[PDB]
């Protein structure tokens, strides 16, 4: 689904819009000999701030040329540090060093 500029420009201030943004990391490459198509894709409306602050991983595939895909993101180490239950009952990350 799409969002007209007509509404982005003339809506009551409280409206919650829902923009969609393709992540094109995994778009297939055209065959080397296939003739060009004609038009250009265009994007009129852009975020002012990063979208996908929620992202934890991206492009879990492997490229056949470069060792890791451009823009592929590994999960953060903190997603994986079970650490410990402190005697108080608060959770803790594992210590980074002895003592």
């Amino acid at each position: 689904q799409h969002v007209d500029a007509e509404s982005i420009m003339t809506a009551p201030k409280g409206k919650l819009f829902h923009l969609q943004f393709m992540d094109g990391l995994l778009r297939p490459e055209p065959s080397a000999f296939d003739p060009p198509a004609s038009g250009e894709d265009m994007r009129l409306i852009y975020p002012l701030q990063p979208i996908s602050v929620a992202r934890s991983m991206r492009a879990i595939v492997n490229h056949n040329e470069v060792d890791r895909p451009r823009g592929a993101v590994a999960p953060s180490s903190y997603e994986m540090d079970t650490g410990t239950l402190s005697r108080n009952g608060d959770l803790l990350y594992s210590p980074v060093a002895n003592g």
Partner: protein, 49 residues
């Protein structure tokens, strides 16, 4: 009987790291990079002992 290992062979610990996808003659081969020299070997044949 256990066949003896021939004199030219190099020992290699298996690891997931050794094998990968790679382009090679218009297909994605299961390449084996070879730790002593680092050469990639897209074909199962022609690999070092």
């Amino acid at each position: 009987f256990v066949p003896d290992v021939p004199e030219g062979y190099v020992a290699v610990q298996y690891a997931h790291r050794l094998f990968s996808s790679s382009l090679a003659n218009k297909r994605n081969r299961v390449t084996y990079t070879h730790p002593p020299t680092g050469m990639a070997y897209p074909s199962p044949t022609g690999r070092p002992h």
